[PDB]
Amino acid sequence: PTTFTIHTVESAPAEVKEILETVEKDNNGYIPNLIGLLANAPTVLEAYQIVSSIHRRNSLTPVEREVVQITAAVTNGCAFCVAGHTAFSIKQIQMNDDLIQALRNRTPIETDPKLDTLAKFTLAVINTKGRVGDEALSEFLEAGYTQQNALDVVFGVSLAILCNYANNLANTPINPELQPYA
Amino acid sequence: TFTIHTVESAPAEVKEILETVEKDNNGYIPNLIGLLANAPTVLEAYQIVSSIHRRNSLTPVEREVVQITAAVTNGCAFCVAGHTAFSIKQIQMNDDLIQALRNRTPIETDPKLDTLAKFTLAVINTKGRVGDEALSEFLEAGYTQQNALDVVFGVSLAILCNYANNLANTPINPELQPYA
Numbered sequence: 001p002t003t004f005t006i007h008t009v010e011s012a013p014a015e016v017k018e019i020l021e022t023v024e025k026d027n028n029g030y031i032p033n034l035i036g037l038l039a040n041a042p043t044v045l046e047a048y049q050i051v052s053s054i055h056r057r058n059s060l061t062p063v064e065r066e067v068v069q070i071t072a073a074v075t076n077g078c079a080f081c082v083a084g085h086t087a088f089s090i091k092q093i094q095m096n097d098d099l100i101q102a103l104r105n106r107t108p109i110e111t112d113p114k115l116d117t118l119a120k121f122t123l124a125v126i127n128t129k130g131r132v133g134d135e136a137l138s139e140f141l142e143a144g145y146t147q148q149n150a151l152d153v154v155f156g157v158s159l160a161i162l163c164n165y166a167n168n169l170a171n172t173p174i175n176p177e178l179q180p181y182a
Numbered sequence: 183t184f185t186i187h188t189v190e191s192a193p194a195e196v197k198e199i200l201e202t203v204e205k206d207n208n209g210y211i212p213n214l215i216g217l218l219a220n221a222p223t224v225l226e227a228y229q230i231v232s233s234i235h236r237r238n239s240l241t242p243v244e245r246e247v248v249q250i251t252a253a254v255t256n257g258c259a260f261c262v263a264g265h266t267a268f269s270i271k272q273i274q275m276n277d278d279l280i281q282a283l284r285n286r287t288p289i290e291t292d293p294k295l296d297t298l299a300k301f302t303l304a305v306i307n308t309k310g311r312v313g314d315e316a317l318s319e320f321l322e323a324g325y326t327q328q329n330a331l332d333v334v335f336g337v338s339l340a341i342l343c344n345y346a347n348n349l350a351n352t353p354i355n356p357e358l359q360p361y362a
Contacts, residue, residue, distance in 0.1 A: 041327075041331035043239065050234075054223050055223075055227075128348075129256045129341075130345030131257075131348045147221075151217075151349075154345050162334065162335060164310065165305060165334050166334050168310030169330065
């Protein structure tokens with residue numbers, strides 16, 4: 001009706017059943033509801049898989065990747081995505097609570113000016129549709145980042161937007177496994 | 183300040199993609215591609231996603247409605263030119279529909295496509311929180327939940343290209359200038 005189906009392995013289209021089973025093993029026995037949602041459109045789930053995979057071998061570090069994604073999730077008001085990336089930052093990257101808390105607030109990162117610049121550059125990209133202006137770009141480059149990193153930030157922003165806008169339109173519920181990190 | 187690469191200047195990892203692109207566009211490389219060459223993984227993601235986008239649940243005409251609507255709303259002059267040229271030369275789209283898309287004018291000839299363009303804008307302008315009324319109006323016009331998700335996917339791909347071009351202030355190829 002107005003509500004989106006959150007697919008299980010059993011209900012999912014044939015084209016994506018393998019992706020769901022893979023995802024369930026990778027998350028140790030549950031499927032994040034984002035994945036159950038995107039299963040409604042096999043193409044969009046297939047794209048999310050491949051891009052997520054390319055995302056993990058890009059020119060930013062893992063922590064830097066999380067800076068872009070949490071900053072984007074908070075700016076786009078996506079509760080599911082903020083929860084997902086908080087859990088991944090705590091459980092898989094093991095970055096410290098002060099880093100995570102500043103990212104969840106979009107407040108200055110006091111212990112790492114290079115990260116602080118990236119998050120501010122991320123925010124500028126989002127708010128300006130890439131038109132960040134010479135000063136912001138120069139501050140980004142002056143912090144030790146390259147023109148390649150800048151495009152990888154834009155790429156991270158497009159990936160977040162896919163997940164954040166999809167979850168916002170569906171009002172995707174947060175899995176019980178993710179509720180503590182919400 | 184951003185390099186727009188040729189086949190010859192580009193990093194080795196992406197030279198094959200650029201050669202393919204040069205053939206696909208009959209002898210030139212869209213500067214968007216030259217720009218993404220700076221970040222090989224991003225060009226690689228663009229190629230794969232672009233091919234997935236072309237086999238999705240929206241029709242070729244519907245895809246261009248989403249993409250042109252997004253380019254115009256995001257103020258990306260390059261993408262508006264690119265998608266106009268593609269709509270005319272490949273798709274041979276109705277001339278009036280394409281002009282209505284570039285000019286943000288109602289699609290009086292096709293209310294379903296007009297609904298699609300409005301849903302795309304609402305998705306962009308509210309970050310997907312369109313409200314129940316807009317979503318229901320989109321579904322009742324004859325689109326599915328799968329269609330809605332492919333629109334969101336359409337929007338994310340447009341933003342990747344739109345925001346990157348906006349950031350580099352990407353110049354329009356001579357071959358695309360007549361469609362600017």
